[PDB]
Symmetry: D2
Subunit: 312 residues, 4 copies
């Protein structure tokens, strides 16, 4: 079956990815690992545990990982007295204490103890934990089935004209990940900007009528608030769960093989995922990387809705 | 009329741009200036003069310019056609000084610069005489690409040859239209286009058809193209009729420090199209294929 | 008593540092950790264990660390089938097996389990293991007493006009190390180029008349061979043991406090340790880094000779 | 004797270099050219003309050059002295064109370029007319530092203002002497030096002493100096008498991509000194303090 480690930084988008992974029976979520850099490790680790608590999934391990980028300095806003959890919603306090041990060591021990070719890594934050794991244990690379990450963009940027937040937070770590010989699917902004939270989608979620569906709808209210000054969007996109959607059903997220590398020296282009789209599509044999292109909007939202129904 | 200086490096594409500029009555070609870097200054200067001779445009000045990029090292008569020997001698003086003297002696807002090679002469002119910038009506250059590269995944040849010079040009306060690969890759030399050109039945139409044979040869191993694109004349096509080359305003800057992204024209396409007041740069987007080829064919017919 | 972890890549220079650390009673060698990048991890790990065996230090743990730089690609010469050990000398086969576990995790566990302010890190290879340890456990940084590394050069380069080998192999890892708030002594080429293996020094070593003194003299024969085409040297320098010499007696290795950072983006200047020598020497309070300047030649060689005598 | 073009940005240091060039009979000052970037072109051009007026050198041409760096953005009387209004009008024409025309019209191997500001005019001249390079006898510039920086830990102001232009200059095949901070930091304006200048007792010696008062003020918070250094005139001192400014041949290039090291003149001092045949660049090392100040004092006396 599809057996995953979800490496994330919740994050309202990551919370939606957690719900999809838990609610779909074709996904075996081995555990959650967290990474600081976009926001503080402490904040996102709490949010991951509280989200899992909300879904009665406290039997899923959570391990905290790296709190800053490999090389460049940490750039997160100062912690606020009177902020816990995810903005705009309420989550129960986690009943299980955080599992002990660094996420990087847990990722390594897990991959080395399971059969080769069975674990899929699903990074939806900066790539720091993944890069660190690779360097600490190079033998994980050939053992991993696939890496399906939310990050980048071949013709679209958000943080800059050409670069995306997860990659730019730790471009060096991204460079490591993209230059290892493992199969990678880059679920970038080109794809995720199609995953629009339209009124009709949200109404179908609202109608489920459970605490979890109300939670998911609350996440979508936050996306709308976050995107309120962004005139490219009437309705906001949701990013991270598109990775899990791809793994559930490849037809939901079309892909195109191409070389992809990360720019780590440029002024204007720092953090760009440079996709070489010249010439015809190379074979999987010749090209270990592929970019996500076209979303099946209708099937994507059906996956979300079905997962929320299954969780009850 | 639009009055132009064509700064170029012929180059079979540039030769087609020269023919379009001469053959269309809405273009007043003030003169040709040449730039080395993509190919040798000596080769392209000869080719420019000989192309003008082929079109009986012996009244058009040619001045040779810079022979290498501003900063990076130099890394370097048209194949497949025959050109008459020029009857007009090469005009004396550096192209950079001629561009400057011409812009300073003509009324402000009347001259449009049309660079179709590396941007070295334009950047050098700007630095040697900063007063040219507000006097120039527009710069319409063949170069770059917002979502398409050829030399690399993200960068185009004219820009990458001299990224520093391109940086200078894009960061001056003058109106710029970037006619990049996104646009020019639509200007396809189909069998039907070439057959219409062949039917004109003159030495010049045979010359143009020869240029098109070269494009095909240059692109023969490029599987993105059944038929080859033609680049440089799209700049002149835009100036003849804006409807032929649609544009989208956006900030554009040139990457000069990146490993992978060297020479990239970085176009900020986030948010809505800003106004001309707020944004001096625009990228070429959509070609009117039918009208574009009609301009070329009509120019070739007009030249007789 | 200075208690050290020697992180190294033997390397004939590192072998001399091991002998000095073992032979001087003011040094407590907690263990040896190894790093690949300058040469292969497998080669230098064997060499470290065999050197320890030669010096009857079978009680000293060895842990193998990272086999390549953090970010940039591995650039080490192709292996030769009739090479084991250190060129030009013979070492006994190690009787103690390689200790299990990654050096990075061992460095972390050791620093976290010992009292704060007691362990001094002594890196004499690329800085990869040290940088990795810092990122995997940020709590080690304030606990470390001092870092005394062989690397860099403020006004002298060897690999380039301005940069030194250990730093250039992994400039990113060096950047990490130099930008943490721990006290650093940079024992660079400015210093080590004074540690000259003159005929008189080597004759005094030869006269000790033991297997170990012959081994040390053999290391010095290799230095001479390595430097044979280098016209800046009549006699070759020895590098790595100058770190241990500084720790034994500060008067042997004078130092000057100054800001030091590592250039990781330059064309010509890649791997340069940029020392700001403008203005007067700042206080230890204000400046955590210092560069080694002047060697006491006579005292340095006395330390080496005395250590070799003590080992018998 | 040595025939020079002094390309400068006065600047109190440059003013001292002008006085030395004029006052020493082994120097033939062909003319002065000015460059903006460290300070504004308008300010330094006026200051150059007024300094020449102060020294009764109204026969010396001044041409204004570039007002900003080649690529990077512009970031910009003489304080503490009084200068007469220039009686000679600014000579017409851009300095870059004047430098080119002068080098091309004089016999090869006779003109020495002496840049004491950013290298923008020199780089621009080289690119506009590559034939100047082999014709120039030598370039002796004030800039850089092999083991000393001032603007940064490793870089010096003139180079960092326009690192690209410096890169151009250092990578042409002409003989270069880099008179950097390693050298100029020895040219100390001690009380005894200044007392000897004061004793000359003329308007010009008072002017020179005023320049020295400014150096002291500029360096008042710099604890590496009890007495301030003077920079630019060390270039002219080298040309008067090589024994005053010792040199060491070595490869020198300019870092234009680094974060920390931007503008560094990277001198490769590994191995023995290569021959003049093999190595076109050399760095200034040791100043003869006593002889240097005697040259300055003698020049001031000669000017009356
Ligand atoms: Ca996320
Ligand atoms: Ca062209
Ligand atoms: Ca070593
Ligand atoms: Ca100056
Ligand atoms: Cl439904
Ligand atoms: Cl397929
Ligand atoms: Cl074909
Ligand atoms: Cl419009
Ligand atoms: Cl404790
Ligand atoms: Cl002895
Ligand atoms: Cl002290
Ligand atoms: Cl600058
Ligand atoms: Cl003072």
């Amino acid at each position: 079956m599809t057996t995953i480690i979800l490496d994330c930084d919740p994050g309202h988008d990551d919370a939606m990815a957690i719900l999809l992974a838990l609610g779909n029976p074709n996904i075996d979520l081995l555990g959650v690992t967290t990474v600081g850099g976009n926001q503080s490790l402490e904040k996102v680790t709490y949010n991951a545990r509280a989200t899992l608590e909300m879904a009665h999934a406290t039997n899923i391990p959570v391990h905290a990982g790296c709190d800053r980028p490999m090389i460049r300095p940490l750039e997160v806003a100062a912690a606020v007295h009177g902020e816990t959890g995810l903005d705009g919603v309420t989550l129960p306090e986690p009943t299980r204490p955080l599992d002990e041990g660094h996420a990087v060591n847990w990722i390594i021990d897990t991959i080395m103890s399971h059969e080769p070719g069975t674990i899929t890594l699903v990074p939806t934050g900066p790539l720091t934990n993944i890069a660190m794991a690779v360097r600490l244990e190079p033998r994980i690379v050939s053992r991993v089935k696939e890496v399906v990450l939310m990050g980048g963009g071949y013709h679209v940027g958000n943080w800059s004209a050409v670069a995306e937040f997860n990659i730019k937070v730790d471009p060096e770590a991204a460079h490591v990940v993209f230059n290892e010989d493992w199969p990678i699917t880059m679920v970038g902004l080109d794809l995720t900007h199609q995953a629009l939270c339209t009124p009709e989608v949200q109404a179908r979620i609202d109608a489920i009528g459970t605490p979890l569906s109300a939670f998911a709808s609350g996440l979508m209210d936050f996306f709308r608030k976050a995107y309120k000054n962004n005139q490219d969007f009437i309705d906001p996109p949701v990013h991270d769960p598109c990775t899990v959607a791809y793994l559930i059903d490849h037809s939901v997220v079309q892909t195109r093989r191409c070389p992809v590398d990360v720019e780590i020296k440029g002024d204007l282009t720092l953090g760009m995922t440079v996709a070489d789209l010249r010439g015809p599509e190379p074979s999987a044999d010749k090209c270990h990387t592929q970019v996500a292109t076209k979303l099946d909007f209708n099937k994507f939202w059906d996956l979300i809705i079905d997962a929320l129904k299954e969780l009850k």
